[PDB]
Amino acid sequence: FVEMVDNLRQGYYVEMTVGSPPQTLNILVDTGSSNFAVGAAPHPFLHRYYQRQLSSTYRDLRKGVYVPYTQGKWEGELGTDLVSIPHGPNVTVRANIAAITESDKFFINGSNWEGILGLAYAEIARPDDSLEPFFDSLVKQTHVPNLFSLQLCGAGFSVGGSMIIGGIDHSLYTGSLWYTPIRREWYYEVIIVRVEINGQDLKMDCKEYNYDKSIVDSGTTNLRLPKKVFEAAVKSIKAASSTEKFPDGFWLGEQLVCWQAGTTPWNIFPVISLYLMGEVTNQSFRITILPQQYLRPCYKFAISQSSTGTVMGAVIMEGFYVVFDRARKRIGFAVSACHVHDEFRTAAVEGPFVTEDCGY
Template identity: 30%
Template structure:
């Protein structure tokens, strides 16, 4: 009887997952902590591989060698259309590095039928360090950010697949991520959908009321105004009292200006290739201290190693989390004194990493393990996919904004607002004082070097003017005598 119940439960789970996988038409999949992967065909004949969809990088990078944990990789010799330049390229991420060679081949995504096959640059990874996770089901990255943060080498930059696509279709392209998380409390596999469309015919764009400007087109850098907990008496930033008004006075009574500036002191980015929500160390400690206190009030016994050191906590059954939601206040595109709020439930950041329900001779053996989806990020702020699950996020690259709306799948995340302040958030949070884009910096350096070269040449000509003048007024015969070659001088000596 026990075995029959177990088999029945497994059958229900399979039917449940099949319903979501096929009825919802998902094309993104991933195991716990491994982000969301997409199937790609590379070369002719096509080789099927899996790549992480990563808004925190730019390059399409593919493993081109067998690893200890996986023998699935791109075989150069099996593609008749591969061109390998032999030029060395490399990339460094917040976790891990790789090096390889710049190449190009035909790229196609079978789950995106409206997107044509295009020849694109790609990096063939031949060596890596802490880049591929043990047992990962993916073999590379599909970078969807801007060119200034692409992989590079000596006098070479790896082009972006998105840029090659836009050149091919002659239209600017946008993409939407619908990340649904896990579909069952007893399963750690998560699902999502990537959709792409050109900006001119995208009716979906009008559905996104809540938009934030991309402050710098390198990564997807945005203005994060605060990260705080809802329904708590202590708030490090915009208070809950503001929710009732729609208008608030932006001063030290309602916001911690130092925290607002600290969140953006290095960069604040939206990164689907990162799991957790990262925040500056001091703000992380404040948020986690409040979460820990809320858990203690709810009589939930969780050790400090879970809250502060990234260790897992396990129970014999799935957990229902009665913890406050996380609120992330983000600058709006509508006005520099307007913002909206992402409300992230505890189901998002109390992340399931293991969901086992096995039947043994002694009965049912269960283990459900969780990790905290919040991290201390030093000086940077990163909204990983933990902040995106339960929402639909549209990246409009050409117009320079990111849209947010509530999703039909996943956790019960919400978007609320808009809320107004009486003063400029750009000015108060020092969002206008960021460094210029990398490509602008390169152009400025080139012009500076050009100007210096012109000045140096002018000074050199001025100093050499007497010598040049004497050279031109010398008689012709004498000029011929001093123009003898080194070989002629040797012959004369002989």
């Protein structure tokens, strides 16, 4: 069964091997992109990298990739090689690999990963949708079911977790698995039908929550909310946590806030419930997150403003077991075996609630 439990370890990475003989690398698990991209030239921040010349099973595709973004970029050439996940399914797959030769502001100092595993769909793959993403190759080439699960655990008092490919490990979650449909197969896009802060509805038009789009992204730390929703959220959090106040550099995710050891007044901060569209249009279900999740360890406010829609990143995925059921075009949520909570409140997955349009 699961040689896959605790296979995850500044982001969550899994161990993979590339080439022949196998070249061990640490690879970020990223549900918000679709390239399998690995460092393949020396970098100050890289202590190891993919060396194509050492791979007997490397094939050049004679094609480059260029990926600029607001801050830096990555460039490399495209090839294919044999790819395994030692603590995953016992298979080897020929997958596309973007060998990164030049980059800036891509690799992180001390992160411990040398590449990225894009688990989203072909539509958003570089340079275009013809470059089959890794998981697409995996399913087609092997008998692994078109599904994977993510249990991100965080710190608690270095991060750990499990990535279960081709199935659902029932020992990883508690209670009920609730599914929200994948709206479109590009990012893992979903629809948020309502949000409340401490049971208090933001009462905004449904479309504001998905203003542009809403995605589930393991490669983002924060819960990122569209401008209008962010401002409403922080106003509601500031009010609930009014008894003794913080600098506004804290609310913008710049400044940290410290108490000592265990005095931390968690119950001063409110819970956040995200209601996601159910499989029955009319039906919905909530995902409730504690301050233990949106205040990440001294703590930083891990909710930030977005200009590209809602991003449900790591801080909301932690404490939930998240199933990426590509086969049935849906994403399941269940309370995780590892969720961090106090003796008064718990992360929750509850439903149904009956509630639209909402899609932007």
